[PDB]
Design an enzyme around this catalytic site. Sequence first.
Site, PDB file in Angstrom:
ATOM      1  N   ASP B  36       0.868  -1.395   0.042  1.00  0.00           N
ATOM      2  CA  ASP B  36       0.054  -0.282   0.331  1.00  0.00           C
ATOM      3  C   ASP B  36       1.357   1.098  -0.273  1.00  0.00           C
ATOM      4  O   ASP B  36       0.734   1.856   0.536  1.00  0.00           O
ATOM      5  CB  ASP B  36      -1.323  -0.295   1.162  1.00  0.00           C
ATOM      6  CG  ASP B  36      -1.989   1.398   1.317  1.00  0.00           C
ATOM      7  OD1 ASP B  36      -1.651   1.897  -0.060  1.00  0.00           O
ATOM      8  OD2 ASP B  36      -2.106   1.512   2.364  1.00  0.00           O
ATOM      9  N   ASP B 220      -1.112   5.902  -5.010  1.00  0.00           N
ATOM     10  CA  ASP B 220      -1.872   4.865  -4.199  1.00  0.00           C
ATOM     11  C   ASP B 220      -2.113   3.249  -4.825  1.00  0.00           C
ATOM     12  O   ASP B 220      -3.156   2.399  -5.253  1.00  0.00           O
ATOM     13  CB  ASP B 220      -3.221   5.160  -3.487  1.00  0.00           C
ATOM     14  CG  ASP B 220      -3.731   4.627  -2.086  1.00  0.00           C
ATOM     15  OD1 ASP B 220      -3.110   3.356  -1.625  1.00  0.00           O
ATOM     16  OD2 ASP B 220      -4.416   4.626  -2.086  1.00  0.00           O
TER      17      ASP B 220
END
Lengths: 7, 374
Positions: B36, B220
């Site tokens: 992440d 992201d």
Amino acid sequence: VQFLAXX
Amino acid sequence: GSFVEMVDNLRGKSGQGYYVEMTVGSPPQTLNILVDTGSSNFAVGAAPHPFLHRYYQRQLSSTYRDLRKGVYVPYTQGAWAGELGTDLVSIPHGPNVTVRANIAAITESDKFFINGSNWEGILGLAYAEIARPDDSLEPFFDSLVKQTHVPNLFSLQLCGAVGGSMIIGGIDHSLYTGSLWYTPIRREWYYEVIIVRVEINGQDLKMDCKEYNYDKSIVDSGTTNLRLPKKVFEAAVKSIKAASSTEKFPDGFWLGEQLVCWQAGTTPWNIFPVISLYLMGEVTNQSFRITILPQQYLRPVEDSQDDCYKFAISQSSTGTVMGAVIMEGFYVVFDRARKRIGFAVSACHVHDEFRTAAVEGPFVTLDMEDCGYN
């Protein structure tokens, strides 16, 4: 998926 | 290549993120960890949960050190609470090192773990500014770089429909074709970048570039969709609808509320437009563009002889999020050492015999500095 709220 | 053992070290299910194996504690406890770049905490399930096959058992790790501090992290969707500590961490298909890193042991959670995703934790690869409880909790990659020789750079090849590669400490040239183009990391918190122009099928969306980055634009890997600020989303959908007008779809399709399915292998990719984002380059007044296909922004839903798709461009109130929809087109280099992010066409990206994702430049774009939110 939906990863940071805030930061 | 020299980084060959790191190739193909990612797995996942479509829409459920990409994960890498990480070995924690002593004796070893290996867990699947979602990668992440949109957060900065390393956290692992550490108690049973209906959706977890395994979890971190701190009492069994001789090297575990309790920090005596609670930690809570909320995401756009989902949240967890846990307890901080440090322990030894290695990535068996990553760099040949072992570090002592902060770890949040997740003890309770809400809408975080996903039934059947096969991952049990999350690796926040962004910067300390956005770490919880605060910026004093050193993120994993910071520890890796401080404690070892590993260069301050990683790169991600996310291969959609799942697999891919996380190369740590460098770049592997088998993972892309053509040239790498770099955009500056505007500020080290999220991986923040600046979008200077948007086109649908070559047609300029013609919005003020400040709209594209209000109130930030980030890369992201932990978000599935391409998320766009409300005003930008609305304009984009109108243009995409106009470009694909040879077929009509219900309003709810464009809102991600309705799926459309085609007979297996008959999806008319050709009727949907390509989408280009221009990014600020490394030289004054110079930009480049990345271009994705409907294969990227229409996502197969799990999952007969019918291929069902969800439109994976969605609305945001917290700025632009370049999630898997963008990243699955490209090999993306997170060059922290040089404060830049590189894009090149991915060797694994999904395309057809007519169109391919692209990274092209240079272009001339003036006043790019003004596009950023203050």
